[PDB]
RNA sequence: GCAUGGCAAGUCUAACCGGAGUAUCCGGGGAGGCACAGGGAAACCGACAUGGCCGCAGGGCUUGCCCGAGGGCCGCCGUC
RNA sequence: UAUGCCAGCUGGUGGAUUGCUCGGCUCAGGCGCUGAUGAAGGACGUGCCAAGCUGCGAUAAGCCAUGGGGAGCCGCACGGAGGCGAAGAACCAUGGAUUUCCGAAUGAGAAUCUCUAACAAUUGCUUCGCGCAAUGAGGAACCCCGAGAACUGAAACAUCUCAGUAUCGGGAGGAACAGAAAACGCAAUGUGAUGUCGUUAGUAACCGCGAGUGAACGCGAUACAGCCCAAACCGAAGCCCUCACGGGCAAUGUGGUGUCAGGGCUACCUCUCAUCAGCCGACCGUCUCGACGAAGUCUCUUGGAACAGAGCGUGAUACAGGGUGACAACCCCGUACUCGAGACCAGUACGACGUGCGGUAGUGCCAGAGUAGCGGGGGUUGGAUAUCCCUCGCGAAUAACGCAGGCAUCGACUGCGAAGGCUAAACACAACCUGAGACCGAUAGUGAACAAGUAGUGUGAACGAACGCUGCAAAGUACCCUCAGAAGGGAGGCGAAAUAGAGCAUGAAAUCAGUUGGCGAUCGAGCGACAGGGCAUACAAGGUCCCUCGACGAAUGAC
């Protein structure tokens, strides 16, 4: 019953990648996005900074918000970022869409889920 | 299809016996009726408690935690960068319609700050000084004695 | 207005002086050129050609013009009663075309020939 | 991307940067939500007379004469909903709020998204518009505004292989139902939307199915009649640029 | 409460003002509301951007061993 | 096979259904008082023939003038007869004439009539004479001032609630009311008349501290506008009526001055554009009305009819809507553009005339009394000690004084001058005009699409229905036969259709007549479901079915 066409496509793509590559994360993330919006992740930077490590793609099965301070040089992959979130992240690292991540790493390797 | 849309043909529309949905008796009385008898459950108990001071003899302090200030230092570039110096009064929203500004010590202070405010909490200082910082009590702030 | 009820109502209840416009008919090619108008108010003197009913193709002199019912009788455009008598079959001017005008009236002629106004 | 500019003769006359908004991802759900609200917001409040069926002292006789306890007057049943000439139980009410709210951000996002749907020939074609062109939207020199005669705009559209859509809209439908009794006998296909910058195009507005608008206030309904994205549009050199900051 | 959607440490404008294609709609309007600190009748004081241990999902590895968001059990902090 | 059961067929009855809309309903904008110069309303008249409606008033569906309009007309209302109109009628706009009786109803009286010149009655002025004037009654609601319930909620009920609601008495206007601080009290080095809208807020406050009730300051908006007396000091310098003469008012004070940027007086400086009064007098905008206004009525076919299909063509600042024998931009009205008039904004804004702002020093000259305030008793309010008002009693100061700032007193501090008065705009309503609609579509929507507040009920107050549709055109059935017959019937005529022939588009069910199939005068009652036999069946929209034998052959399973 999702209404957003892009969110549906993302979920479709997330499943294709998980069924055709060495990655159970994508399908896992697909399962969480299929759940009601209220359960989706809403994470501020402060949390990414605390549990992320470099060269390990941070994957947010939701949206990234701008509260807190991120210093680590990490790549954050999420369904969406607030304007400030994407800004603070691009400064010390990189902000990428779950659509790009699925394309650069269909095997979904070396990645940590954060909520 | 909604629940409402499926009731035609049901006769009772989910009410159970057709003898149920009548007047207020089906609710035990109108409004908060029985809040001390049949429906006392979960209701706050009866009684008076405390008092209130007149609203014009009341002070509303504008507060802020160091955590807020500290996490936004570099962004608050539009404010002193000495050996940062920051007049909290120029930072807090609602500071205008408030009787004074107070710095609270929630969180950390990863920089050396010179904070200027009408008042600070014990922990607010300890942390600020602790990070090789200072605390400056405004003129109004000079109301502690 | 745009509402159908009000449009028909304004037409059925229009005062007499406003009913002349309900008996107007288009003019022949020549007449339009001659008086610089596309149509005119059919008079009991004009000659007209029927272009639509069962009498389409016939031409005749207008013998009567009823403003109360907004219809006209044209010579020879009739119906035969049960007894045999021949009565006129009323026509809507909208189905007719004026091929010859009766200008016996100076006011009408002056009106037609003028530019600012039309007859 | 870049969009080709055309002169009143239909000949190419340079080209400009197609503003970024036309890159906004097409969102039919948001667009539909936006059109739904504009359509609801112009609906008028209505409802039956609040005392209808109530102007009677009708009383019930109660038990005794072998009749159901129904209020009667002059031997006639009245007032109650089951009675002919009685009140309406749960009728249309004037106090009802028939408007729909919509956050400004959410509405603006839909406008940008409807704009972006205009630059996709495949969509525009899916929506239904007829044309033999490849590039869309159609951009024209600001001189377009100085036109005055409708047939002039006709020539230009034919020269642009876009007039076919006006032929599509040159068919009215006499609707089924009683809308006719209320002034809604006809309806017709939506054709070309002309977006200028100074004033709507008086010369183009009477074209079958055509809609005229201005870059500063062109809305979601203009761009997506009925909430269906991808309307065959024609902008003005300036309109194109001004529409960029919406 | 819930489902969906926008924006997010913020979010939303209300009356109302200008424009216009003139009840729609485009722009403006943050007054004010709720959220961003609590505790205490009040005076008044004023907090974990993480210290420990389990461990689901997921990730890693040399395939039992690591990392382990969320969660669980504690510490500790504000106030009466 | 009679009486009869079930189903259908032809024809009725009935008026569902579908389609249609001259009526409703709701919203929006505009506009907004009438009456003794007799209103609103009612009665009775008024037509060639005239019952109802509409109009009108003994000049009676109308009279006159100006402008518009135009060859027709004599309302609804489709008759007959007759008449009017180029001496420019009808019709429309504006203005005028006529305008019976009752009615506030006013000479007295009275169920719409009568009896012997009349502002009846209450007032003001007064020439003391009804001489000059006012009031009275109406209006959909809105508005202001008074009187003020109960059902109900609290699951009973008394305070509380419903509610200052319903209803009653009085009164004004186009809007009312309010309104230039004895204010506010984000307490301030701050705001600055008043409504109203949003918010403040279900906050403060109330309350068998139960149920419930419930603001304000402030802020953001809308619109903005400030003034006049009493007194001091002057003291007839004045006002009203009359053409005038003249009369009346006025020392118990007309008039000048003045009004918290306090004022006055004495002495000065300077100066007015403040204010008050009067004159002139719009733009624009909005609402309504009006004028003008492009382009096909071409071919073929179907049809009763082209507004259909196919072919060719055209306008568009006009492709809103309607009409016209069927789906119409181009046949007619309109519609876009442009233009004109009236109304409202508004006797307002601007402009101009006059007046003259303000400042210094001195001066205890002036500045609203049953008041401010207190007490007894009530009501009311969120107002709690701290709301507003009524009532009984008591009762002050004089600016060097007094009031307020949410208990009292005193001091300080801040604010402000009560006991006189006026005041535009922004806001309420919807009678009236116009526009609009995801509203209803004749058992709906108004009670009312029709004779509608009709017919009808009740002594009265009051109550109160139902009734929409011939057709393209009345071509609304001539002649003949029958009959007691303008009835009805038969035959006939018209039309595409009379199974469109008068509550006359369609024409369901219940149900009735006739009739077809099946059953039926020895047999049993939830009327059927599922199986299987009889008999019945035009086409179309379903085309399968049966028997020998053979193949396959689950559980089961022999002689
Ligand atoms: Cl977080
Ligand atoms: Cl308190
Ligand atoms: Cl203030
Ligand atoms: Mg002419
Ligand atoms: Mg009804
Ligand atoms: Mg239908
Ligand atoms: Mg009398
Ligand atoms: Mg009770
Ligand atoms: Mg008021
Ligand atoms: Mg109780
Ligand atoms: Mg109350
Ligand atoms: Mg207050
Ligand atoms: Mg009370
Ligand atoms: Mg009815
Ligand atoms: Mg019939
Ligand atoms: Na029930
Ligand atoms: Na009634
Ligand atoms: Na409403
Ligand atoms: Na705000
Ligand atoms: Na009016
Ligand atoms: Na009559
Ligand atoms: Na008269
Ligand atoms: Na009088
Ligand atoms: Na007298
Ligand atoms: Na009770
Ligand atoms: Na009782
Ligand atoms: Na109480
Ligand atoms: Na403020
Ligand atoms: Na015609
Ligand atoms: Na009160
Ligand atoms: Na008292
Ligand atoms: Na005060
Ligand atoms: Na009916
Ligand atoms: Na059978
Ligand atoms: Sr239920
Ligand atoms: Sr009941
Ligand atoms: Sr209850
Ligand atoms: Sr108890
Ligand atoms: Sr604020
Ligand atoms: Sr007539
Ligand atoms: Sr007539
Ligand atoms: Sr009994
Ligand atoms: Sr906003
Ligand atoms: Sr934890
Ligand atoms: Sr003001
Ligand atoms: Sr005074
Ligand atoms: Sr005090
Ligand atoms: Sr009926
Ligand atoms: Sr009604
Ligand atoms: Sr009786
Ligand atoms: Sr016959
Ligand atoms: Sr076998």
mmCIF file of C-alpha atoms (C1' of nucleotides) in Angstrom, chain B residues 24-25 28-36 38 46-48 52 55-56 99, chain F residues 152-155 185-188 203-205 209-212 215-216 405-406:
data_model
loop_
_atom_site.group_PDB
_atom_site.id
_atom_site.type_symbol
_atom_site.label_atom_id
_atom_site.label_comp_id
_atom_site.label_asym_id
_atom_site.label_seq_id
_atom_site.Cartn_x
_atom_site.Cartn_y
_atom_site.Cartn_z
ATOM 1 C CA UNK B 24 -26.418 7.789 27.627
ATOM 2 C CA UNK B 25 -27.241 4.768 29.769
ATOM 3 C CA UNK B 28 -22.949 5.136 32.159
ATOM 4 C CA UNK B 29 -23.952 8.765 32.014
ATOM 5 C CA UNK B 30 -22.985 11.776 29.939
ATOM 6 C CA UNK B 31 -19.463 13.199 30.012
ATOM 7 C CA UNK B 32 -17.408 12.288 33.091
ATOM 8 C CA UNK B 33 -20.407 10.912 34.921
ATOM 9 C CA UNK B 34 -19.551 8.357 37.600
ATOM 10 C CA UNK B 35 -15.862 9.289 37.792
ATOM 11 C CA UNK B 36 -16.103 8.543 41.523
ATOM 12 C CA UNK B 38 -19.061 3.140 38.607
ATOM 13 C CA UNK B 46 -10.474 13.800 43.620
ATOM 14 C CA UNK B 47 -8.896 16.726 45.457
ATOM 15 C CA UNK B 48 -7.122 20.077 45.609
ATOM 16 C CA UNK B 52 -0.255 29.103 42.068
ATOM 17 C CA UNK B 55 1.589 35.209 36.652
ATOM 18 C CA UNK B 56 3.265 38.632 36.826
ATOM 19 C CA UNK B 99 13.445 37.393 31.731
ATOM 20 C "C1'" U F 152 -32.121 18.570 30.047
ATOM 21 C "C1'" G F 153 -26.840 17.412 32.150
ATOM 22 C "C1'" A F 154 -24.895 16.052 37.025
ATOM 23 C "C1'" A F 155 -26.543 8.774 35.064
ATOM 24 C "C1'" G F 185 0.646 47.145 34.732
ATOM 25 C "C1'" C F 186 4.737 41.671 28.725
ATOM 26 C "C1'" A F 187 6.687 46.948 35.955
ATOM 27 C "C1'" A F 188 8.797 49.641 31.834
ATOM 28 C "C1'" U F 203 -4.601 29.133 29.935
ATOM 29 C "C1'" A F 204 -5.882 32.449 34.860
ATOM 30 C "C1'" A F 205 -10.307 32.309 37.531
ATOM 31 C "C1'" C F 209 -13.346 21.796 44.046
ATOM 32 C "C1'" G F 210 -18.368 17.055 41.335
ATOM 33 C "C1'" A F 211 -20.461 17.483 36.521
ATOM 34 C "C1'" G F 212 -19.419 21.417 34.244
ATOM 35 C "C1'" A F 215 -11.984 35.545 30.517
ATOM 36 C "C1'" A F 216 -8.185 39.560 30.154
ATOM 37 C "C1'" G F 405 -1.693 49.383 39.557
ATOM 38 C "C1'" G F 406 -6.474 41.794 41.173
#
